[PDB]
């Protein structure tokens, strides 16, 4: 199932992913927090999964939120680095899904991160073309949930 | 405390961590697996914590082990990248510790990784100087467990 989803990651998709990541991944703390705060602003219900982070309204200033946001970006860094070898991408994605499955995060719920990604990309001037590429990567993870 | 341990990362310690990581971090899949296989060989008692990975002796051929090993290297990548800002290093370390605390991994248990790191470092021509530098980094995580 995950292998099949990985099949949608074509040469053009992987190229747009790497190109956009070169910019987005250059400021992990800044963009990581931007992603999380956008998620919470657009889909307030998702906050229920993050009680441990405390007062998420503090954004960057919240050490726990900042710490989680940075770690999140290194997962994406991992995914991007494994794009040229489906076997490694798959094992890394499945490894990654384990904890989210335990937290009872469904594929539909996980898909809520697409809006935030689209907006973060746009803030850096990466249009719909890139947004669609990232939706495909997220789709690989969704297949593992 | 983790704050006091983080202050032990002096200028030269940070430099030796970077110089050595530049090499070790070049092959995350290869060195990550070697790191885990060495841990399981020198400390068989830790294998119990990794029941989910299945047959750990298969090494590289074990998809779950390969996935975990890669993820492990990106956590180290994360730590290395945060060396410039103590505040960020701390929040990333505490975030990382959460899951290990949940699995009941004590500071003494975590410290067993020092052996494997020293051996991998040595296999790449990095001696005691570097192994001790990494022990310092590991000690930051230990202070958070
Ligand atoms: C591309 C998007 C995402 C990435 C790359 C990502 C990455 C991560 C990473 C690396 C961790 C830390 C390791 C772990 O405990 O598994 C984590 C933890 C977590 N993730 Fe995800 N995640 C994403 C989206 C989501 C979404 C959409 C939700 C919620 C609806 C979610 C909920 C959680 C929770 C609850 C934790 C634990 C937070 C804490 O208490 O520190 N994740 N995620
Ligand atoms: C250089 C030291 C280490 C690093 C950087 C590291 C890194 C990681 C990472 C990134 C994960 C995946 C995210 C998560 O679930 O928290 C993890 C999982 C885990 N770690 Fe650590 N770890 C280290 C040492 C250890 C040691 C020494 C033990 C136990 C003796 C341990 C036990 C575990 C276990 C049981 C898991 C879950 C494995 C699975 O079910 O896939 N870790 N670790």
UniProtKB/Swiss-Prot annotation, chains A, B:
Tell me where on the tree of life, at the top rank, the source sits: Eukaryota
Q: State where the protein is found.
A: Cytoplasm
The UniProt keywords, alphabetically, are: Cytoplasm, Heme, Iron, Metal-binding, Oxygen transport, Transport
Q: Does the keyword rRNA-binding apply?
A: no
**What InterPro entries does the annotation carry?**
Globin, Globin-like_OT, Globin-like_sf, Globin/Proto, Mb-like_M
TM region positions: none
Chain sites annotated for binding heme b: 100
A cellular-component GO term for this protein: cytoplasm
An MF annotation (GO) of this entry: metal ion binding
Which ranges carry the Globin domain?
8-145
* Keyword Cytoplasm among UniProt keywords: yes
Q: List the disulfide bonds.
A: none
Checking PANTHER family in the record gives: BLR2807 PROTEIN, GEO09476P1
What family is this? Answer: Belongs to the globin family.
Q: Whom does it interact with, and what assembly results? A: Homodimer.
Q: What is this protein called?
A: Globin-1
Please name the source species.
Anadara inaequivalvis (Inequivalve ark)
């Amino acid at each position: 199932s995950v292998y099949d989803a990985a099949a949608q990651l074509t040469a053009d998709v992987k190229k747009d992913l790497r190109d956009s990541w070169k910019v987005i991944g250059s400021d992990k703390k800044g963009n990581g927090v931007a992603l999380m705060t956008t998620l919470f602003a657009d889909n307030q219900e998702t906050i229920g999964y993050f009680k441990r982070l405390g007062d998420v309204s503090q954004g960057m200033a919240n050490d726990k939120l900042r710490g989680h946001s940075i770690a999140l970006m290194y997962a994406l860094q991992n995914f991007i680095d494994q794009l040229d070898n489906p076997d490694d991408l798959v094992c890394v994605v499945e490894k990654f899904a384990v904890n989210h499955i335990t937290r009872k995060i469904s594929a539909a719920e996980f898909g809520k991160i697409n809006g935030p990604i689209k907006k973060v990309l746009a803030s850096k001037n990466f249009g719909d073309k890139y947004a669609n590429a990232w939706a495909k990567l997220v789709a690989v993870v969704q297949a593992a949930l």
